[PDB]
Amino acid sequence: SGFRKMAFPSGKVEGCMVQVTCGTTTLNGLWLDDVVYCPRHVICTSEDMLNPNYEDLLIRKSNHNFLVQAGNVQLRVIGHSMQNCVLKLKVDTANPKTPKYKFVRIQPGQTFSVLACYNGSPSGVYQCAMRPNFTIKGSFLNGSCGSVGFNIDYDCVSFCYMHHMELPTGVHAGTDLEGNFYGPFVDRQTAQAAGTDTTITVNVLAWLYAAVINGDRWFLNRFTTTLNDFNLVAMKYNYEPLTQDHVDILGPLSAQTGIAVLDMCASLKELLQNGMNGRTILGSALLEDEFTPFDVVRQCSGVTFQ
Amino acid sequence: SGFRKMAFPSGKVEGCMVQVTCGTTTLNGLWLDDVVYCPRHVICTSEDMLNPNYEDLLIRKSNHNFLVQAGNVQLRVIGHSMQNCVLKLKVDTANPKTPKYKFVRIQPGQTFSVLACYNGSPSGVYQCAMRPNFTIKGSFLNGSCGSVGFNIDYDCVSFCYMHHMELPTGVHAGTDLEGNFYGPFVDRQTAQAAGTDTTITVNVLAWLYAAVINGDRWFLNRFTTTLNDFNLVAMKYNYEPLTQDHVDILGPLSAQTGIAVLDMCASLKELLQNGMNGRTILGSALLEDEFTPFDVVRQCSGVTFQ
Ligand SMILES: *[C@H](O)[C@H](C[C@@H]1CCNC1=O)NC(=O)[C@H](CC(C)C)NC(=O)[C@@H](NC(=O)OCc1ccccc1)[C@@H](C)OC(C)(C)C
Ligand SMILES: *[C@H](O)[C@H](C[C@@H]1CCNC1=O)NC(=O)[C@H](CC(C)C)NC(=O)[C@@H](NC(=O)OCc1ccccc1)[C@@H](C)OC(C)(C)C
């Protein structure tokens, strides 16, 4: 029993974090096979950040201007290129600790673990979700740039996020590992609006299922509702519309608890309409939306990795 | 910027989790040097759990009745003993992945990371606190027994917790690595009350400091208060009494933010007396108490490990 926001074990990703330096700027890179991946703004000064011509800036640099350090072991750069907003530094040695990996672009609402690093050394790990407006609400200080987000599927690490910037909100923006930003953001120190965020409705329902499984069932009400009537409530409350796809993925949770999806929708409707009267659900006084239906299944299934 | 409940990177502890089997019962053990540590109730059946005579039960067992598996590598048990509520199995090979480690008994209010495992394979990682009533509110299913809690100080892993049981609350109880329970609990399937829990006041203040650092300052009020007057409010609200020791440890936070400890005490007093009016602090509608003053300093300092 019990429900906790749980991150993947970070061992396989720790053995891939290196420190990349170019000029005075130092940040974290990801070392897989004989390639090091890091934010391309490692090549910028503080002044360059206001309006960088990245192709121009990169031309001034050669292989030896890039210092890659792995702990204290240290790598020879023999090729460099820019893929969108990441740089790829070709080094002379494969990472002997390269896990089975792949690069994936995740979708809004999906969750992932973040290993926050500084100077190429891991600091801590926490779990979060790609918000529908393609930001994440993380914990990132100066030098955490290049820290990565990932999921683990038994032995295979799916890298999905690399940290690039903080916005004027304290929210965070970043790219996949092909260097394509999530969201409309660019890697420039110029005012950028995230846009209206919305609540991940299918994740809220999954959490509400997780609550029922763990004994907390006071919100379980008398009522039911329709998909369209519930959706009509979701949008006054800035919730993402619920589709039949969302119903289907909550199916397993529906059948383990014996509660139809639409009856949970109605319970969630009165919660949106009436508040919590200062009660809590799984130790929270807010409706929690960074658990996917798979995060719930996996936590009350006990799935392991290595 | 940003504030997240962050766990230590689990890499050093992953390389120590093994699977221990005795009879039909299987659980997790911790393999350091040539010794494997695990809950002594691995030696019990389901019926034994109601009232176990552990010394008697252990006499029926020999070295070869204990199957230790590390991934698929596999260990030869050449000695076994019972230290309080842990068994120690002497194996024929040192763990080549033994980190610099030590065993520590932590105090109520301190925090630690938990690596939840099943069958000796890590499943996920999350952070928590030893509640003042010596329970933890974790996420533990059948077979997670023997999963450990730890802190990391640069390169040194301080193991402080091993999971043994769930109580009739869904809260969790366990031992240090010398096998001494935290709390008044015994390893028997007999009704056991945790006792009244209280809120870790010095941790709440630290979080409130963390909030100020991250821009959230609406609760910062006009008032101040005295240690004794605040304490008189803390105990109607089941808060732990605040000592001058607690003031001193909040000192660094006091000086980085320029807010006297007693003025935060008064802000926290009206929060206890008046609620949050449905507002939030660092994305929570509850007063958060599983961040120590060091967890705060370390997260807005960017301390790394390896
Ligand atoms: C790299 O380690 C660092 C990590 C940042 C700094 C502290 N926390 C973080 O997450 N990242 C950068 O320096 C990064 C480089 C860009 C190329 C991606 N820049 C930023 O994070 C800035 N973000 C930014 O300028 O966004 C657009 C903007 C918003 C508001 C006002 C003007 C422009 C940071 C440094 O800017 C702050 C945090 C808004 C001051
Ligand atoms: C070992 O993997 C397993 C882990 C438990 C089970 C699922 N979640 C967990 O945290 N632990 C045990 O089987 C453990 C063995 C004891 C020697 C420590 N026993 C328990 O966790 C039981 N706890 C218990 O009996 O506490 C006293 C008690 C409370 C309430 C009623 C009677 C006795 C569990 C199995 O008992 C439940 C969870 C109360 C059913």
PDB file of all heavy atoms in Angstrom, chain A residues 58-79:
ATOM      1  N   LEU A  58      29.145  29.046 -33.924  1.00  0.00           N
ATOM      2  CA  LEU A  58      29.751  27.720 -33.950  1.00  0.00           C
ATOM      3  C   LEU A  58      30.961  27.673 -34.874  1.00  0.00           C
ATOM      4  O   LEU A  58      31.892  26.897 -34.639  1.00  0.00           O
ATOM      5  CB  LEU A  58      28.707  26.689 -34.377  1.00  0.00           C
ATOM      6  CG  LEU A  58      29.117  25.220 -34.443  1.00  0.00           C
ATOM      7  CD1 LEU A  58      29.616  24.751 -33.090  1.00  0.00           C
ATOM      8  CD2 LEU A  58      27.937  24.393 -34.903  1.00  0.00           C
ATOM      9  N   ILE A  59      30.976  28.506 -35.911  1.00  0.00           N
ATOM     10  CA  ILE A  59      32.090  28.492 -36.846  1.00  0.00           C
ATOM     11  C   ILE A  59      33.378  28.937 -36.167  1.00  0.00           C
ATOM     12  O   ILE A  59      34.469  28.477 -36.524  1.00  0.00           O
ATOM     13  CB  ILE A  59      31.739  29.361 -38.064  1.00  0.00           C
ATOM     14  CG1 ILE A  59      30.771  28.594 -38.963  1.00  0.00           C
ATOM     15  CG2 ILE A  59      32.976  29.760 -38.836  1.00  0.00           C
ATOM     16  CD1 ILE A  59      29.849  29.485 -39.759  1.00  0.00           C
ATOM     17  N   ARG A  60      33.284  29.808 -35.165  1.00  0.00           N
ATOM     18  CA  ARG A  60      34.474  30.286 -34.469  1.00  0.00           C
ATOM     19  C   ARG A  60      35.132  29.192 -33.635  1.00  0.00           C
ATOM     20  O   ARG A  60      36.256  29.387 -33.158  1.00  0.00           O
ATOM     21  CB  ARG A  60      34.070  31.472 -33.593  1.00  0.00           C
ATOM     22  CG  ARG A  60      33.544  32.600 -34.452  1.00  0.00           C
ATOM     23  CD  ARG A  60      33.192  33.890 -33.747  1.00  0.00           C
ATOM     24  NE  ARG A  60      32.777  34.839 -34.781  1.00  0.00           N
ATOM     25  CZ  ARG A  60      31.519  35.220 -34.996  1.00  0.00           C
ATOM     26  NH1 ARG A  60      30.541  34.731 -34.253  1.00  0.00           N
ATOM     27  NH2 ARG A  60      31.239  36.073 -35.972  1.00  0.00           N
ATOM     28  N   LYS A  61      34.462  28.051 -33.460  1.00  0.00           N
ATOM     29  CA  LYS A  61      34.901  26.976 -32.583  1.00  0.00           C
ATOM     30  C   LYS A  61      35.451  25.797 -33.383  1.00  0.00           C
ATOM     31  O   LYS A  61      34.957  25.472 -34.467  1.00  0.00           O
ATOM     32  CB  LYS A  61      33.747  26.488 -31.692  1.00  0.00           C
ATOM     33  CG  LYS A  61      33.052  27.574 -30.870  1.00  0.00           C
ATOM     34  CD  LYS A  61      34.023  28.277 -29.930  1.00  0.00           C
ATOM     35  CE  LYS A  61      33.288  29.090 -28.867  1.00  0.00           C
ATOM     36  NZ  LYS A  61      34.264  29.884 -28.038  1.00  0.00           N
ATOM     37  N   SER A  62      36.481  25.159 -32.826  1.00  0.00           N
ATOM     38  CA  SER A  62      37.015  23.896 -33.314  1.00  0.00           C
ATOM     39  C   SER A  62      36.917  22.842 -32.212  1.00  0.00           C
ATOM     40  O   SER A  62      36.680  23.150 -31.040  1.00  0.00           O
ATOM     41  CB  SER A  62      38.479  24.032 -33.775  1.00  0.00           C
ATOM     42  OG  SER A  62      38.699  25.171 -34.597  1.00  0.00           O
ATOM     43  N   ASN A  63      37.141  21.586 -32.615  1.00  0.00           N
ATOM     44  CA  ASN A  63      37.074  20.444 -31.702  1.00  0.00           C
ATOM     45  C   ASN A  63      37.769  20.724 -30.373  1.00  0.00           C
ATOM     46  O   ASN A  63      37.200  20.470 -29.306  1.00  0.00           O
ATOM     47  CB  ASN A  63      37.691  19.208 -32.367  1.00  0.00           C
ATOM     48  CG  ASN A  63      36.817  18.645 -33.467  1.00  0.00           C
ATOM     49  OD1 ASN A  63      35.598  18.803 -33.437  1.00  0.00           O
ATOM     50  ND2 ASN A  63      37.430  17.982 -34.439  1.00  0.00           N
ATOM     51  N   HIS A  64      38.988  21.271 -30.410  1.00  0.00           N
ATOM     52  CA  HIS A  64      39.744  21.475 -29.176  1.00  0.00           C
ATOM     53  C   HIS A  64      39.187  22.585 -28.288  1.00  0.00           C
ATOM     54  O   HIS A  64      39.649  22.726 -27.151  1.00  0.00           O
ATOM     55  CB  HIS A  64      41.220  21.760 -29.489  1.00  0.00           C
ATOM     56  CG  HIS A  64      41.467  23.070 -30.166  1.00  0.00           C
ATOM     57  ND1 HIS A  64      41.777  23.170 -31.507  1.00  0.00           N
ATOM     58  CD2 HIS A  64      41.483  24.335 -29.686  1.00  0.00           C
ATOM     59  CE1 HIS A  64      41.960  24.437 -31.821  1.00  0.00           C
ATOM     60  NE2 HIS A  64      41.787  25.167 -30.733  1.00  0.00           N
ATOM     61  N   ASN A  65      38.213  23.371 -28.756  1.00  0.00           N
ATOM     62  CA  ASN A  65      37.572  24.346 -27.880  1.00  0.00           C
ATOM     63  C   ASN A  65      36.521  23.718 -26.980  1.00  0.00           C
ATOM     64  O   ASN A  65      35.937  24.429 -26.155  1.00  0.00           O
ATOM     65  CB  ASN A  65      36.894  25.452 -28.684  1.00  0.00           C
ATOM     66  CG  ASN A  65      37.874  26.333 -29.408  1.00  0.00           C
ATOM     67  OD1 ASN A  65      37.707  26.594 -30.593  1.00  0.00           O
ATOM     68  ND2 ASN A  65      38.921  26.773 -28.717  1.00  0.00           N
ATOM     69  N   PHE A  66      36.241  22.424 -27.145  1.00  0.00           N
ATOM     70  CA  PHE A  66      35.221  21.718 -26.374  1.00  0.00           C
ATOM     71  C   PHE A  66      35.916  20.760 -25.419  1.00  0.00           C
ATOM     72  O   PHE A  66      36.555  19.794 -25.851  1.00  0.00           O
ATOM     73  CB  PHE A  66      34.254  20.965 -27.286  1.00  0.00           C
ATOM     74  CG  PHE A  66      33.335  21.853 -28.054  1.00  0.00           C
ATOM     75  CD1 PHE A  66      33.468  21.994 -29.425  1.00  0.00           C
ATOM     76  CD2 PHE A  66      32.326  22.548 -27.405  1.00  0.00           C
ATOM     77  CE1 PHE A  66      32.602  22.821 -30.142  1.00  0.00           C
ATOM     78  CE2 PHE A  66      31.463  23.375 -28.115  1.00  0.00           C
ATOM     79  CZ  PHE A  66      31.603  23.512 -29.483  1.00  0.00           C
ATOM     80  N   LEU A  67      35.790  21.031 -24.133  1.00  0.00           N
ATOM     81  CA  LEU A  67      36.378  20.213 -23.086  1.00  0.00           C
ATOM     82  C   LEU A  67      35.283  19.330 -22.485  1.00  0.00           C
ATOM     83  O   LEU A  67      34.367  19.830 -21.821  1.00  0.00           O
ATOM     84  CB  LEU A  67      37.021  21.115 -22.040  1.00  0.00           C
ATOM     85  CG  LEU A  67      38.418  21.680 -22.349  1.00  0.00           C
ATOM     86  CD1 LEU A  67      38.458  22.604 -23.565  1.00  0.00           C
ATOM     87  CD2 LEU A  67      38.865  22.431 -21.129  1.00  0.00           C
ATOM     88  N   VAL A  68      35.363  18.024 -22.733  1.00  0.00           N
ATOM     89  CA  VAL A  68      34.450  17.046 -22.152  1.00  0.00           C
ATOM     90  C   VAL A  68      35.177  16.305 -21.039  1.00  0.00           C
ATOM     91  O   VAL A  68      36.220  15.684 -21.281  1.00  0.00           O
ATOM     92  CB  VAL A  68      33.933  16.064 -23.212  1.00  0.00           C
ATOM     93  CG1 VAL A  68      32.938  15.089 -22.584  1.00  0.00           C
ATOM     94  CG2 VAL A  68      33.320  16.828 -24.380  1.00  0.00           C
ATOM     95  N   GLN A  69      34.636  16.361 -19.822  1.00  0.00           N
ATOM     96  CA  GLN A  69      35.185  15.626 -18.689  1.00  0.00           C
ATOM     97  C   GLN A  69      34.125  14.695 -18.101  1.00  0.00           C
ATOM     98  O   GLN A  69      32.983  15.108 -17.852  1.00  0.00           O
ATOM     99  CB  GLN A  69      35.716  16.579 -17.614  1.00  0.00           C
ATOM    100  CG  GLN A  69      36.693  15.919 -16.651  1.00  0.00           C
ATOM    101  CD  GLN A  69      37.340  16.897 -15.680  1.00  0.00           C
ATOM    102  OE1 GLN A  69      37.652  16.537 -14.545  1.00  0.00           O
ATOM    103  NE2 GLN A  69      37.550  18.134 -16.122  1.00  0.00           N
ATOM    104  N   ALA A  70      34.506  13.436 -17.897  1.00  0.00           N
ATOM    105  CA  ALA A  70      33.648  12.415 -17.303  1.00  0.00           C
ATOM    106  C   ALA A  70      34.265  12.049 -15.956  1.00  0.00           C
ATOM    107  O   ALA A  70      35.281  11.349 -15.901  1.00  0.00           O
ATOM    108  CB  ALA A  70      33.529  11.202 -18.220  1.00  0.00           C
ATOM    109  N   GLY A  71      33.650  12.521 -14.875  1.00  0.00           N
ATOM    110  CA  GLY A  71      34.306  12.454 -13.586  1.00  0.00           C
ATOM    111  C   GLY A  71      35.639  13.162 -13.666  1.00  0.00           C
ATOM    112  O   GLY A  71      35.688  14.395 -13.674  1.00  0.00           O
ATOM    113  N   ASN A  72      36.730  12.399 -13.729  1.00  0.00           N
ATOM    114  CA  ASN A  72      38.029  12.939 -14.100  1.00  0.00           C
ATOM    115  C   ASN A  72      38.620  12.270 -15.326  1.00  0.00           C
ATOM    116  O   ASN A  72      39.539  12.830 -15.931  1.00  0.00           O
ATOM    117  CB  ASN A  72      39.028  12.833 -12.937  1.00  0.00           C
ATOM    118  CG  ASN A  72      38.985  14.047 -12.022  1.00  0.00           C
ATOM    119  OD1 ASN A  72      39.918  14.851 -11.995  1.00  0.00           O
ATOM    120  ND2 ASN A  72      37.888  14.195 -11.283  1.00  0.00           N
ATOM    121  N   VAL A  73      38.127  11.087 -15.701  1.00  0.00           N
ATOM    122  CA  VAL A  73      38.413  10.567 -17.026  1.00  0.00           C
ATOM    123  C   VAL A  73      38.069  11.648 -18.041  1.00  0.00           C
ATOM    124  O   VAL A  73      37.211  12.515 -17.813  1.00  0.00           O
ATOM    125  CB  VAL A  73      37.619   9.278 -17.300  1.00  0.00           C
ATOM    126  CG1 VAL A  73      38.119   8.601 -18.574  1.00  0.00           C
ATOM    127  CG2 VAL A  73      37.654   8.346 -16.095  1.00  0.00           C
ATOM    128  N   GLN A  74      38.750  11.620 -19.179  1.00  0.00           N
ATOM    129  CA  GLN A  74      38.605  12.766 -20.047  1.00  0.00           C
ATOM    130  C   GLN A  74      38.842  12.421 -21.507  1.00  0.00           C
ATOM    131  O   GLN A  74      39.769  11.675 -21.857  1.00  0.00           O
ATOM    132  CB  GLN A  74      39.528  13.877 -19.590  1.00  0.00           C
ATOM    133  CG  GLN A  74      39.703  14.891 -20.633  1.00  0.00           C
ATOM    134  CD  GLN A  74      40.755  15.843 -20.262  1.00  0.00           C
ATOM    135  OE1 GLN A  74      41.092  15.976 -19.083  1.00  0.00           O
ATOM    136  NE2 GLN A  74      41.415  16.394 -21.267  1.00  0.00           N
ATOM    137  N   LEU A  75      38.036  13.060 -22.347  1.00  0.00           N
ATOM    138  CA  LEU A  75      37.680  12.608 -23.678  1.00  0.00           C
ATOM    139  C   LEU A  75      38.266  13.541 -24.732  1.00  0.00           C
ATOM    140  O   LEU A  75      38.450  14.744 -24.511  1.00  0.00           O
ATOM    141  CB  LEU A  75      36.150  12.551 -23.801  1.00  0.00           C
ATOM    142  CG  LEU A  75      35.424  11.369 -23.154  1.00  0.00           C
ATOM    143  CD1 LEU A  75      35.522  11.422 -21.643  1.00  0.00           C
ATOM    144  CD2 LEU A  75      33.948  11.397 -23.564  1.00  0.00           C
ATOM    145  N   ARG A  76      38.560  12.969 -25.889  1.00  0.00           N
ATOM    146  CA  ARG A  76      39.126  13.699 -27.015  1.00  0.00           C
ATOM    147  C   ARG A  76      38.027  13.890 -28.050  1.00  0.00           C
ATOM    148  O   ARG A  76      37.461  12.908 -28.542  1.00  0.00           O
ATOM    149  CB  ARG A  76      40.318  12.936 -27.597  1.00  0.00           C
ATOM    150  CG  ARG A  76      41.292  13.757 -28.384  1.00  0.00           C
ATOM    151  CD  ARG A  76      42.448  12.887 -28.866  1.00  0.00           C
ATOM    152  NE  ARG A  76      43.444  12.621 -27.827  1.00  0.00           N
ATOM    153  CZ  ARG A  76      44.401  13.470 -27.465  1.00  0.00           C
ATOM    154  NH1 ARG A  76      44.506  14.649 -28.059  1.00  0.00           N
ATOM    155  NH2 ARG A  76      45.257  13.138 -26.508  1.00  0.00           N
ATOM    156  N   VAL A  77      37.718  15.144 -28.373  1.00  0.00           N
ATOM    157  CA  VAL A  77      36.685  15.484 -29.342  1.00  0.00           C
ATOM    158  C   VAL A  77      37.279  15.458 -30.744  1.00  0.00           C
ATOM    159  O   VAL A  77      38.240  16.191 -31.040  1.00  0.00           O
ATOM    160  CB  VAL A  77      36.061  16.850 -29.029  1.00  0.00           C
ATOM    161  CG1 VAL A  77      35.025  17.216 -30.074  1.00  0.00           C
ATOM    162  CG2 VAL A  77      35.444  16.846 -27.638  1.00  0.00           C
ATOM    163  N   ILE A  78      36.705  14.647 -31.625  1.00  0.00           N
ATOM    164  CA  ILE A  78      37.217  14.465 -32.969  1.00  0.00           C
ATOM    165  C   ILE A  78      36.224  14.839 -34.051  1.00  0.00           C
ATOM    166  O   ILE A  78      36.506  14.697 -35.236  1.00  0.00           O
ATOM    167  CB  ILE A  78      37.720  13.010 -33.170  1.00  0.00           C
ATOM    168  CG1 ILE A  78      36.554  12.013 -33.080  1.00  0.00           C
ATOM    169  CG2 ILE A  78      38.744  12.674 -32.095  1.00  0.00           C
ATOM    170  CD1 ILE A  78      36.791  10.703 -33.867  1.00  0.00           C
ATOM    171  N   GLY A  79      35.044  15.333 -33.667  1.00  0.00           N
ATOM    172  CA  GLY A  79      34.049  15.830 -34.593  1.00  0.00           C
ATOM    173  C   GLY A  79      32.984  16.560 -33.804  1.00  0.00           C
ATOM    174  O   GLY A  79      32.747  16.228 -32.639  1.00  0.00           O
TER     175      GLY A  79
END
